[PDB]
Amino acid sequence: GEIQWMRPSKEVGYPIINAPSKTKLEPSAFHYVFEGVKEPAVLTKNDPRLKTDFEEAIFSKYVGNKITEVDEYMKEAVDHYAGQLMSLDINTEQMCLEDAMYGTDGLEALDLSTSAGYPYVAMGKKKRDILNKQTRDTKEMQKLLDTYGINLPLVTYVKDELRSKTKVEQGKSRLIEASSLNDSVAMRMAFGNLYAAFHKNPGVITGSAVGCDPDLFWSKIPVLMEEKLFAFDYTGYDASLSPAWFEALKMVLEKIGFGDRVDYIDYLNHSHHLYKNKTYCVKGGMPSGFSGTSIFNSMINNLIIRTLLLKTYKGIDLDHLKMIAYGDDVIASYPHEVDASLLAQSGKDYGLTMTPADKSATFETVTWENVTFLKRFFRADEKYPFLIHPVMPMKEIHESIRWTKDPRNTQDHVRSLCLLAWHNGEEEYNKFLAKIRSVPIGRALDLPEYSTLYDRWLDSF
Numbered sequence: 001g002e003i004q005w006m007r008p009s010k011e012v013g014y015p016i017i018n019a020p021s022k023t024k025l026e027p028s029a030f031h032y033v034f035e036g037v038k039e040p041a042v043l044t045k046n047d048p049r050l051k052t053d054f055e056e057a058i059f060s061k062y063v064g065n066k067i068t069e070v071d072e073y074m075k076e077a078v079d080h081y082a083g084q085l086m087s088l089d090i091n092t093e094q095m096c097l098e099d100a101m102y103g104t105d106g107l108e109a110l111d112l113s114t115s116a117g118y119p120y121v122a123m124g125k126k127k128r129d130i131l132n133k134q135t136r137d138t139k140e141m142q143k144l145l146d147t148y149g150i151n152l153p154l155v156t157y158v159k160d161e162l163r164s165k166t167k168v169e170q171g172k173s174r175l176i177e178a179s180s181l182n183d184s185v186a187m188r189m190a191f192g193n194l195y196a197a198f199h200k201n202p203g204v205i206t207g208s209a210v211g212c213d214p215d216l217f218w219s220k221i222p223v224l225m226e227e228k229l230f231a232f233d234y235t236g237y238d239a240s241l242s243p244a245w246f247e248a249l250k251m252v253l254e255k256i257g258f259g260d261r262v263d264y265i266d267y268l269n270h271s272h273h274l275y276k277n278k279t280y281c282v283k284g285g286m287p288s289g290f291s292g293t294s295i296f297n298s299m300i301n302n303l304i305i306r307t308l309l310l311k312t313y314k315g316i317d318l319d320h321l322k323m324i325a326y327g328d329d330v331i332a333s334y335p336h337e338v339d340a341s342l343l344a345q346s347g348k349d350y351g352l353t354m355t356p357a358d359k360s361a362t363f364e365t366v367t368w369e370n371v372t373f374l375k376r377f378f379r380a381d382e383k384y385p386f387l388i389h390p391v392m393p394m395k396e397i398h399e400s401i402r403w404t405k406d407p408r409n410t411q412d413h414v415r416s417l418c419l420l421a422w423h424n425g426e427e428e429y430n431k432f433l434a435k436i437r438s439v440p441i442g443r444a445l446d447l448p449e450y451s452t453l454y455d456r457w458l459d460s461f
């Protein structure tokens with residue numbers, strides 16, 4: 001991804017966009033009961049904690065574009081992946097406005113809490129003033145589509161979240177690019193059925209894990225994986241995507257019956273954005289921050305891995321590449337051992353910056369013991385080995401519980417963390433609950449004991 005130009009929005013006919021400057025994150029009732037070192041990300045250039053230019057730090061995510069055209073390896077990758085997707089018999093019909101808006105089987109309704117983007121954010125018009133969950137009214141939406149049309153500017157927001165001390169100082173906050181409600185709705189109409197098909201088929205055929213339930217899906221993953229696992233992390237995946245990867249995606253869509261709407265992909269690839277009093281044009285880079293791009297990022301990841309394998313190991317048998325992606329996150333496998341370090345090298349030529357899986361300093365062998373997917377390890381249940389626990393370390397959970405975005409959601413926030421934590425075992429889980437119950441707010445919460453969560457887990461299969 002590369003910013004082509006940036007200039008005052010008024011110069012190209014746009015209003016200044018107001019974006020909150022204060023974090024809604026504040027110490028929770030457990031701030032001093034659990035250990036943690038993360039704080040809210042810098043949201044403005046005038047943050048006392050900064051140590052380097054802010055604006056420069058947040059837009060530096062666009063490292064540039066290493067490639068423009070789709071080479072021969074990418075074409076092969078495209079034919080193999082498209083071929084796989086073909087077996088799912090995906091309904092290529094456009095989805096009706098109602099379902100695209102309020103959801104259907106395999107597609108959750110449009111999120112009402114997220115920004116409605118341009119121009120609604122400059123009209124003080126909220127989604128709640130357009131969508132009726134209970135009415136499933138499409139008249140107001142339809143009127144807005146006819147009025148403002150599509151291909152509108154995306155609104156940039158700095159993501160309000162916890163970040164490491166170093167990242168706070170270096171202004172490394174994550175920029176979020178929100179599509180207009182009109183575009184988001186239009187895209188869910190064009191690809192709604194593709195999305196549902198992916199949500200209902202998490203695994204190695206879609207090569208996707210979006211929409212999955214870790215508590216249940218972790219038991220299915222090992223059976224689909226090959227003999228030898230391999231993985232790695234990406235540095236700024238979304239922003240690093242070159243235009244060619246978007247072209248490769250269009251080819252996959254064409255081959256599976258959606259060549260009808262590959263233009264929407266151009267809208268993601270070559271896009272313009274609004275940030276405060278500025279507007280800028282980006283070549284490449286997947287608009288980051290929201291679920292609308294999850295599937296396309298996963299699809300592109302399937303193309304990337306295949307491409308690097310073809311480029312690095314001529315004669316590789318892609319039919320035996322078993323991988324599952326969730327955006328940039330990935331867990332892959334092959335009957336034979338591969339060199340991640342080497343793949344990383346080939347990746348550089350394609351504009352991808354790949355590093356050792358889970359912040360290792362060197363590329364080590366990935367095993368069922370050290371592999372993580374969505375930050376969760378895999379652990380067989382001591383009583384029933386065939387049931388696999390998704391284990392997220394307590395560290396991140398402790399970091400999260402030390403802050404709150406709304407006292408009204410303390411119950412849900414903490415219950416959420418409990419669903420993640422009990423998998424670390426009864427000993428660890430009880431220590432967690434006891435610490436929670438060492439302060440008034442915690443004792444007033446209705447939280448499930450270990451026994452209850454274990455039984456509920458077995459009863460969910």
Ligand code: NA
Nearest residue numbers: 268269284285
């Ligand atoms: Na873009």
